[PDB]
Amino acid sequence: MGSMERASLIQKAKLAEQAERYEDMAAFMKGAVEKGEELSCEERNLLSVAYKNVVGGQRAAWRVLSSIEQKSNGPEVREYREKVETELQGVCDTVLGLLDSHLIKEAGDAESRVFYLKMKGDYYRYLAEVATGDDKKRIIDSARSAYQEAMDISKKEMPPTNPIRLGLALNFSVFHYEIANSPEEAISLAKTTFDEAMADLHTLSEDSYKDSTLIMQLLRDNLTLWT
């Protein structure tokens, strides 16, 4: 996307979102990141929405194929699951590469740095979902390390109701439950996050209250499923 203006890439990413063309949206946002400038809050959201939709479709397909393969146990189901898996890994590697070149290193404000480190944790988590064996171990540790650094910053620099802090805690709790085989840690983190947010709601405007309580309900939904 080297020949397209940064502003045009951003505009087209917004159009692609409206048109539900998430692969295009991700390509436009990759082009925008590669212009080398930092991303604004809204631009970070466009980047994240684009890739979350792309990798979300790949994950759903991988789970369908992996289930068929497990029930079967010719080479075709395994071959096709492997094809989808390689594609998924390629998208995760692309996102991680953007974060490493050079979004995280230039992100100094807590809102940007936490956002990108949460993304890093999430895309290593998606890699861990399809990994096996010792490869799984290092990938799991990479996700954990990213989430932990984000958590440390968020607790020092953001109020307990901040939506990014809440979503980070939600996703790290899912990591503990689904990836790290630590359901007690998952439940403890979700509980403590919910309770500390509750106690801070009194400080919020109507609009912020709506955002924070929406995410707190997701924490509660997981707690209900886990307990």
Partner: peptide, 9 residues
């Protein structure tokens, strides 16, 4: 369980 949906923004 459920991570943040994050597919609309």
């Amino acid at each position: 369980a459920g991570s943040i949906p994050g597919r609309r923004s």
